[PDB]
Amino acid sequence: RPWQMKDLQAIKQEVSQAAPGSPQFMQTIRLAVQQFDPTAKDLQDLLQYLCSSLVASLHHQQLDSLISEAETRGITGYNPLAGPLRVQANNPQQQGLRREYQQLWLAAFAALP
Amino acid sequence: RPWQMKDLQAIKQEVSQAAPGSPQFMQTIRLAVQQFDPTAKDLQDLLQYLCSSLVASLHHQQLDSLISEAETRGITGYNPLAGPLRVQANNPQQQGLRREYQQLWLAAFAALP
Amino acid sequence: RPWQMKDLQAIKQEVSQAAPGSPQFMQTIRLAVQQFDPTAKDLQDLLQYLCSSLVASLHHQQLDSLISEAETRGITGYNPLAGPLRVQANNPQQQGLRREYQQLWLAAFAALP
């Protein structure tokens, strides 16, 4: 049951004033993601929806660095021989992957300033 | 039948102006808690959405003290050999613990100002 | 079809300007009660939601007076061998008791001033 249009518009409107990485932005986005459990595809939809392309690029760089760090350290069930981290997360049989991807996404978003 | 994004958005918006623990906030939060019948996990999510980390920490300490006294006295449904009240309240077959957790939560949050 | 968050939040939204006993307050309360046909549980929830604790206490004094008067006089389907009207209105198969309780509720609210 991925978010429809109205859910995403409520999400966008509530955070009009707050700048990326602010506590309010992070709070609301954390609620949304932890309520809907969206795969990487849908998180990309949301990120391209809310902020500009510059913020998306910054987030992508930060998320790539975080993926490298937390994948060399180790992940509970990351089998990197069966596809990249993004693809495994989007599989609906890899709940752990979805959870870790969501946490990495949120950390990268919070790590702008 | 857990709450959805719209319910949380309405709960936060209706009480944006008021202060934590004000009679208005207490009315709305008590109604939500008594209506949706949530466990500890959902209550933690709601608190993270509503108030900042400072208010979250203060409520955490106050609720720790309240749960401390309550379950140190001894409660009808609490069996300390299975886990902390935060975990028993998350099992849907322990509604007594869930209601006690809800009431300790609301009282603790009301005791802030 | 017991009311959710949205219904009660509306009710309080349009019962915010007026004061208890005023024509608007009673209009809205009577409409809601006549529509959802709520028992004593939901009625007490609605009252705790709407007004301060002082007004709720006053209303309950008036309601106890009305209920005592009616039980002395006699109710069509009230059988005191099982429990008070207070508890007889929670059973879904006692529509008469529930509607009588709703009417005493509305009267006691209308007679506050």
Author numbering:
A (entry chain C), B (entry chain A), C (entry chain B): 13 to 125
Copy the relevant paper text.
To analyze the structure of immature HTLV-1 lattice interfaces in more detail, we engineered an HTLV-1 Gag truncation construct for bacterial expression, purification, in vitro assembly and analysis by cryo-ET. The MA126CANC tubes exhibited varying helical parameters. The helical pitch and densities for large side chains were clearly visible at this resolution, which enabled us to build a refined model of the immature CA-NTD lattice interactions. The in vitro assembled tubes had the same arrangement of the CA-NTD layer as the full-length HTLV-1 Gag VLPs (Cα root-mean-square deviation (r.m.s.d.) = 1.2 Å), underscoring the biological relevance of our in vitro system. In our model, these residues are located in helices 1 and 3, respectively, which form the hexamerization interface together with helix 2. To further characterize this interface, we substituted residue L43, which interacts with M17 and Y61 in our model.
The retroviral structural protein Gag forms the immature protein shell of nascent virus particles. All retroviral Gag proteins contain three canonical domains: matrix (MA), capsid (CA), consisting of independently folded N-terminal (CA-NTD) and C-terminal (CA-CTD) domains, and nucleocapsid (NC). During immature virus particle formation, these domains function in membrane binding, viral lattice self-assembly and viral genomic RNA (vgRNA) packaging, respectively. Our results show that HTLV-1 uses a distinct CA-NTD arrangement to form the immature Gag lattice and that, in contrast to other retroviral structures, the CA-NTD is the key determinant of immature HTLV-1 assembly.
